[PDB]
Structures are given as C-alpha cells and as structure tokens.
Design a protein around this ligand. Structure first.
Ligand SMILES: [Mg+2]
Ligand SMILES: [Mg+2]
Ligand SMILES: [Mg+2]
Ligand SMILES: [Mg+2]
Ligand SMILES: [Mg+2]
Ligand SMILES: [Mg+2]
Lengths: 106, 197, 136, 172, 190
RNA sequence: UGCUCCACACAAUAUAGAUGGAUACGAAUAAGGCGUCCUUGUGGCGUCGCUGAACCAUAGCAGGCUAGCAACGGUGCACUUGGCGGAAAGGCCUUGGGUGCUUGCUGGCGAAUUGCAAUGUCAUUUUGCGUGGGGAUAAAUCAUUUGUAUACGACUUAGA
C-alpha cells in the first residue's frame, strides 16, 4: 500500500552509564509508543536493527546493518536495554533503530 | 511522531519548557519554538529584572568582548536557558542544538503549521493560582530588546489573516460535519458503529 | 436593562455526587460520595460496580455531572438502593463521555480482520460522504 | 510503612520469688510493625516504672483494628513534642475514618508545621469526639456544616504525552 | 487556614445594570459607564436576584479572602460612583503668598496650573484626568472641587494636586502651604 | 570552444539518521469551543471536553495484466485562469479542460525455488562527465600613480 513497515521505530539514546562512566556494551533504546516497563516487557528479546548507509558497496549494497536484541527494561518510562553484536557507534545517540516483531510470541 | 515539532511558546514556563526541548533535541527530535516573546517566568517582573541585571554585571574584566554575552531578545533568553541543559561544547551537543530554532512571533513558513503546547511546561497548569509571573517580552524590552513593537505589529497582522483562514476552515468543517451526520444511520454507518467507528 | 453574569458551572463536591475512579483497583468504575472528610479526601461507595466503601483522595477520582439524592453517611445498602432508584448507571451510559470510553475500549479490542473490515467500510462511507459534499 | 498500625502491647516485670504474677501493664502503640511497637512499649515503660527490657517480658502484642473503618470521625489528639528549645503539649483535631490514619496525618502535620520528627513526639491521647459542637478547631469545624458542598476550581489534568495539540482547559 | 467558602454581597440599585465578563466588570447607571479589570483576583461572581451579586472565594487563604472583601468594595465604589458620583473638595492653604489656581488648555489637555505657590516662579501643571471635572465654588474661599463617576480617578487627580504643592527644604510643620483634600463625598448626595 | 540555466544519462560523493500525513484561529483558564435563534449582546438555548486512545490516510507483482456495473464523485500529473502572501514572503487559494488511476461494487488471469530469517536495497545531498536545448559576452589584482592615507600591509585617487 503506502506503508510497508513491519517494525516499530525506536531511538538510540545512549549507552548504559553512571554519572561519569559509560558502558558501550549496553545501549538504551526508546521504543515509539512504549511508556512503562509493563509495555516494554512485550519487546524483550525482539531483534533490533540499526540501518545505516555507507558510500562503498560491500556485497551488492550501500546499506549496512548492526543487529542486536532487547535484553531488559530500563527505568520507569518504557526505555529498554539492547545489546548489539557489535556495539553501536555512539554517534548514533539520537538516531533511529528498527525493533522487529520477531521472534514472535503473540 | 512529527519530523518537525513546532511549540507555541506562549504561556509556558521558560525553564520547564527549556528542559523538555533539551531532552527532545538530544533524543533527535527537530524542534521549532515560536512566540518566544510570550514565554513566562515564574516570579515578579522586578525579581526577574533584578536577576538579569545581576547577570548583566558579570563580564570578562580585561576585555568585555570575550565575556559572558548577554543576549536581550526573548528567543535568545530561551536559548541561553536551553544551553546549560545541553552539553553544548561537545559534537553531540552541537548536533542537538542544530535541531532547534527559536523565533519571536510566528514567521513563515510556520504560520500555516500546527503549533503544539507542552502541558508539562504550561504556566496555566504548573503555577499556583495567584502566583506572580513575568512575560519574557517585557523583561526583554526592559533589558534592551528593541523589536517588541515590530513583533507586536506583525503578530497582529498574522492573527488577522489566521482568523480569516479559520473562518473558512470552520465553514468547511461545518459542511463536512453535516454530510457525515447525514450519512450516519445508514447501513455502512451502523456496521462502522458496531466496530467503535 | 438587566444584570448579566456568567454562571461558570462547576461540578460540586457533595454527598450523592457520582465519581469515576481513575487510579487503583477500581480504575474506571462509578462510585458515590457519602462523606466529605476534608478538602481533599471523600468517603466513597460503589456497590453496584463493586467499589468498596473507602476514604479516597479527590485527585485520583474525577467528578461527573451526575448526582442523585442521598443522605450523608448512608451505608452501603442505602447507597445501592438509592443508586438503583435514581438509575445512575443508565444516565451514565447515555452520556457521550461513557460512549467515548466504550468507543476506545471497543476500538482496542478489534482484531486484524476487524480492522481490515473497518477500512473497507470507511472507504465506502467516505465515497458517499464525498459525493454528497460535491452535490452540496 | 504503607500506614501506621495500632497494637496493644501488654508486658510485665519478670516474676520473682518475692512477687510472682506482677501487674501486667498495657499500652496502645502506633508503630509501623511489631518490632517497633515492642520497642516503643519498652521506651515508654522506661519513663513510668522501674523496669527495662532485660528485667521485663512482653506478654502480648495484638493489632487493634478500627471498629468502623468506613465511618468518618472527628478525632481529638493530645501530643507532647520536643521543639528545638523545649517541650510543649498541644491538642489538634483530625477528621478521618480511622485512628491509625489520623495519627499518620498527625505525624505529617507535626513534621510540616513544627519540624517535629517522629523521634520528638509523644502521642498522649487519641479520642473521637462523639458529639458535634465539642469540636473546637475551625479547620475541622468548617467541614461539619449542613449540606456542605464545594467545587474544585482550576482542574489540572495529567498528560501522558509530552506534546498537546489542544491548548487545554481547566474547567471542572 | 484554607476556609472552604468566603462570601461577599454586592447590592445593585434600581437603575443600574452590572455585567460581568470573565472578570471584567461593567457598571452602567444614571451617570454613565465604568469598566474594571479584576482578572488578578481569582474570584467567582454570581447573580442572585438582579438586586444582589455574590462574589466568592473557594478554598482560599488569608490573603485571598482579604482580596475578596477588597473586590466587593471596588465594585461598590463603581456602583456608588455611577449613581451618586464622587466629589472631593480641596482647600488652598497659604500663609503669605496667595496660591493662584486656574484651568488652562494646551492643544486640548486641560491642565490645573498652580502659580505663586510660596512665591515660586515655577508654574505647576497638573493634568486633568478624563472623566474628572474641575470647578471653583462661590460662597467659600480658596477651594477646588473635583468630581466624576470614578472614585479612583477623582482621588488620584486630587492626590496629584496635593502632591505637586509639597514644600521642599523647609520645616513643613511651619510651612504648611499646599492644596489639601478637605472633604470626600458624593455629587448627587442630598 | 570557455561560462551559465534547463532537460536527461552515467559516474562518483556523502548523510547527527525518510520509512503513511509537521494535521495553521485567536483569546481565557475562578473559563472556553462548537451549533442554533433573536432584540447582534459581557445575549438566550443546546451541546462538548475529563486528552492525539484523535482526524485523515490506509486492500492491489514496494502493489502487475485485463472485463464489466454504478456514480460524475475522489485523487495524481503536467498545461492553464485569476487572486492573495515581504517577518525569513518562495507558499496558500482558485479556474478550465486534457491525460491516468480509482479498492464505491462484481469479475478472470499472474505471483511459487529469495528455498524456515538475513535493511534485503525503493530516500535526499553534493560534485563531476556526456548529450541536446535556451541565455549572456566582465572584472579584480600586481606593476605605474595620489597623499585626504600610511611602520609594512592596508587606505584613498588617477591612467587606452
Ligand atoms: Mg548519550
Ligand atoms: Mg544507564
Ligand atoms: Mg568569558
Ligand atoms: Mg496552531
Ligand atoms: Mg547596546
Ligand atoms: Mg533650612
């Protein structure tokens, strides 16, 4: 039709951090439309893709992906924690991610 | 959900609006703030004028041109508040601040765009009834902002054209509502009503 | 020739006022105010929808325009009998406010097939409405 | 401490050969749980009789429920408290549906208006006023007028979203 | 304290119509029309029987209820000024130098000029507020009468005249010269 | 055989981060919106809110080929009529017909093997290069010169 989306939008906020030490191994994601941990429990274990573009074609594509998954909820406001096979680059704080509906339980 | 979010700054509390926008910018949302001159600060006009004068007196002693710049315009007073809530010396903070535009009044192209409010930062909701508050336009004028009159004149001109647009929109909305009400009680409408629509 | 004043109608905190609980185990049920404890807390009772007699803060409940005649301090059986006599549920269900609550609950319950049907019906209704707007 | 609870605490001196079966003193204690109630009991028996926890024994502790939790009552409360410069007695009136929440209101009131911590307060007495016109504080007396009804002007609605498209109203 | 309701009553007479906006009061009577902004008080007006208006404060504190009685007086002064009017009379007080008070005009401005105050060569100009009427009355000497439907304007114009003749650089207990309000009353009182 | 604009063709370059729609009164908030009527007002009456949990859009090989019915609507694209918009207008509203689609309704055909998933590629920026179609045909600096200038630069004058 006009929309072909099968993923929920999300935003890469930052790494897990204290006041003055961050941890790139874990990322904080805001899922569009999730406001509480109770809602954020639905997306636990779902796969996240970060989709970006590069100038150099690699394997028949100028588009590249970093694949991760939602591990747990974070705070009271629906923010979740995500882990990616390679850590997100930290210039993507504020950048969009795609949270897929697979693996699917409902 | 919008690509650009236009906030009408009228009747908002400057610091609570500032924190909201600073979080929005850092989270990657482009924000335009209009009618900066209609922003509110809680407290009397004298208190806030005294606070700006205290801000005015601090400057690099040996060269006043390398010191704390004291911007007078309301949009810049808002911008200064929003800086300091943004780590503005970093690349991430610069990229956040580049997602923001603050204007006096409503200029084009935002005249014909939806303006939102932030109820979290609205004075009418936050401030206790009877509490004295300041308007950023008269604060800015008292500390040296020059363009309150031109802003007011252009805003009156915009409000007149906008009221005329609204009169036409209201007439069409009336006609649309009448056609939709007439279509009700038909078969398709009753099936729709059984589905919450 | 006459004094004109805007009345500024307000829902009053009063015995026999009907309230909708928004926070807690009830959260969407109708109760009646039986006592006023202080400026912020009122004793409420919702025996028809099963709200226990309790002291509740006014900030977690929303006053409705509906009121019914009820003595102050009326016990649960008295509250229920006068609630049935005044037919508070039926007056509530007639309100566009309750219609809107039922509407959003019915919308949330729709399946994927039901949503697809809603699209098809909306397009058909739109077809008739647009044709009418063109003719008028 | 979702709220206070009221316990009856009965204790006695330890029995001796000289005096078997001592006198069994009892108090009503407002405390968050059993342990605090027993501690408060000994602390107050410290000030009345020659006995301490080591020379004494807790015979019974029983939570005391409100006889009618769903009846609004006017409570008169006598408290003794230590301010920064001395000790003072006062009497306050609290309207609510139970003794425990009336006392809970009282501790909040003492903290707010006199900066009196729970550390620095003695509940001398709590008693319902069974008759109107024995109520003496105007802040509770104003609520007993016939057919009382007031509005709640300037309703402020809580928004779940960050942005509103409507420029709201405070009507009610 | 937080009183639940505090209540005040404004009585309106036979030939007066009082219209209240959000909190903009318009009082119309025999002598004209007054308007007053009261959007700083947070009170509620309600019409009772076309002879009684009730203004109330709900869940108000000490300063709030004090403002309520203030509002009642302000509306009362509107109704009094639109039916009976306000008339302030001032007396010229001078020991040696006679005070010369006249009404002059400059491009339609209607000033009150004080000349010869303590023998000063400076002429004192006090503007006449809109709605205020100045007259100098026969049968009693050195007196100026200010009249109007607005008590605030009549009183402030009278105060402006009294203040402009403040003796400077002298013992004011000995140098009493000035123009002093001597009577506060009504125009159509009889 | 230079420069500039347009159009289409390939290259390269990147992306602070498209993935249905940024969806326009103003003002008050101890008040308002909408509708209706009149004696056009600080009017009567009705109605609404208690969130956008909305409205709009939205089905078709990432959306194919093809047959009809009903209506004369919707919408796209260029060509076009007029008007408005200077705060940063660069957009808004319209007119006319033309050329498409239309899922408002009823059909017939196609899809497969990307193999049980791999963004599975659909966007908008900049700069080149080529082709074909319009358009225009300068200056500045150094050197020389002045002294209203001047440490040197700079400044300020003159010179087919
Ligand atoms: Mg970060
Ligand atoms: Mg963290
Ligand atoms: Mg500095
Ligand atoms: Mg708007
Ligand atoms: Mg300056
Ligand atoms: Mg002297």
């Amino acid at each position: 039709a006009e929309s072909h989306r099968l993923y929920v939008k999300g935003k890469h906020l930052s790494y897990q951090r204290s006041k003055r030490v961050n941890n790139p191994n874990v990322s904080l994601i805001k899922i569009e439309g999730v406001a509480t941990p109770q809602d954020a429990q639905f997306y636990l274990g779902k796969r996240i893709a970060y989709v970006y573009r590069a100038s150099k074609e690699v394997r028949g594509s100028k588009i590249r992906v970093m694949w991760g998954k939602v591990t747990r909820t974070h705070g009271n406001s629906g923010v979740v924690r995500a882990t990616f096979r390679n850590n997100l680059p930290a210039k993507t704080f504020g950048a969009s991610v795609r949270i897929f509906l697979y693996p699917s339980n409902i | 959900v919008e690509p650009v979010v236009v906030i009408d700054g009228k009747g908002h509390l400057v610091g609570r609006l500032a924190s909201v926008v600073a979080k929005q910018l850092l989270n990657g949302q482009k924000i335009v703030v209009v009618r900066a001159e209609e922003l509110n600060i809680s407290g009397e006009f004298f208190r806030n004028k005294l606070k700006y004068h205290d801000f005015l007196r601090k400057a690099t002693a040996f060269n006043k041109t390398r010191g704390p710049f004291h911007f007078r315009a309301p949009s810049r007073i808002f911008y200064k508040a929003l800086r300091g809530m943004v780590s503005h010396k970093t690349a991430r903070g610069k990229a956040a601040l580049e997602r923001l535009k603050v204007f006096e009044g409503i200029p084009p192209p935002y005249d014909k765009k939806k303006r939102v409010v932030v109820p979290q930062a609205l004075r009418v909701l936050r401030l206790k009834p009877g509490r004295k508050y300041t308007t950023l336009g008269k604060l800015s004028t008292s500390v040296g902002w020059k363009y309150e009159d031109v802003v007011a004149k252009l805003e009156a001109k915009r409000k007149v054209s906008s009221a005329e647009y609204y009169a036409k929109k209201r007439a069409f909305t009336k006609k649309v509502a009448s056609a939709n009400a007439t279509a009700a009680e038909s078969d398709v409408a009753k099936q729709l009503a059984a589905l919450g629509y | 020739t006459d004094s004109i004043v805007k009345a500024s109608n307000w829902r009053l905190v009063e015995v026999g006022r009907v309230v909708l609980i928004k926070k807690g185990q009830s959260a969407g049920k109708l109760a009646a105010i039986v006592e006023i404890i202080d400026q912020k807390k009122v004793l409420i009772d919702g025996p028809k929808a099963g709200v226990p007699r309790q002291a509740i803060n006014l900030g977690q409940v929303v006053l409705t325009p509906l009121t019914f005649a009820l003595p102050r301090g009326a016990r649960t059986a008295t509250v229920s009998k006068k609630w049935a006599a005044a037919a508070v549920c039926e007056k509530w269900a007639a309100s566009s406010w309750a219609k809107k609550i039922a509407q959003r609950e019915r919308r949330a319950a729709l399946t994927d097939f039901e949503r697809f049907q809603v699209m098809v019906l909306r397009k058909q209704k739109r077809y008739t409405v647009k044709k009418a707007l063109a003719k008028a | 401490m979702a709220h206070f609870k009221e316990y009856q605490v009965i204790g006695r001196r330890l029995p001796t050969e000289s005096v078997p079966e001592p006198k069994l003193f009892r108090m009503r204690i407002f405390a968050s749980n059993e342990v605090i109630a027993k501690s408060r009991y000994w602390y107050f028996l410290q000030k009345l009789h020659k006995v301490k926890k080591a020379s004494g024994e807790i015979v019974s502790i029983n939570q005391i429920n409100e006889a009618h939790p769903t009846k609004v009552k006017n409570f008169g409360v006598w408290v003794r408290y230590d301010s920064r410069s001395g000790t003072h007695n006062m009497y306050k009136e609290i309207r609510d549906v139970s003794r425990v929440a009336a006392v809970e209101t009282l501790y909040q009131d003492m903290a707010a208006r006199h900066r009196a911590r729970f550390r620095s307060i003695h509940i001398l007495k709590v008693a319902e006023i069974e008759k109107t016109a024995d109520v003496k504080r105007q802040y509770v007396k104003q609520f007993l007028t016939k057919d009382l009804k007031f509005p709640l002007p300037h309703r402020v609605q809580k928004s779940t979203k960050t942005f509103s498209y409507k420029r709201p109203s405070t009507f009610y | 304290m937080k009183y639940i309701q505090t209540e005040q009553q404004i009585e309106v007479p036979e030939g007066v119509t009082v219209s209240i906006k959000s909190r903009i009061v318009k009082v119309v009577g025999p002598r004209g029309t007054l308007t007053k902004n009261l959007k700083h008080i947070d009170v509620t007006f309600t019409k009772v029987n076309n002879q009684l208006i009730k203004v109330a404060v709900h869940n108000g504190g000490r300063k709030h209820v004090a403002a309520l009685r203030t509002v009642k007086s302000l509306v009362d002064n509107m109704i009094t000024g639109v039916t009976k009017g306000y008339k302030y009379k001032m007396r010229y007080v001078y020991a040696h130098f006679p005070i010369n008070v006249n009404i002059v005009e400059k491009d339609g401005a209607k000033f009150i000029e004080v000349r010869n105050f303590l023998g000063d060569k400076k002429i004192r100009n006090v503007p006449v507020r809109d709605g205020v009427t100045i007259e100098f009355s026969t049968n009693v000497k050195d007196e100026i009468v200010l009249s109007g439907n607005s008590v605030e304007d009549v009183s402030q114009n009278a105060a402006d005249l009294q203040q402009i003749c403040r003796v400077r650089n002298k013992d004011i207990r000995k140098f009493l010269d000035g123009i002093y309000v001597s009577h506060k009353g009504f125009i159509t009182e009889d």
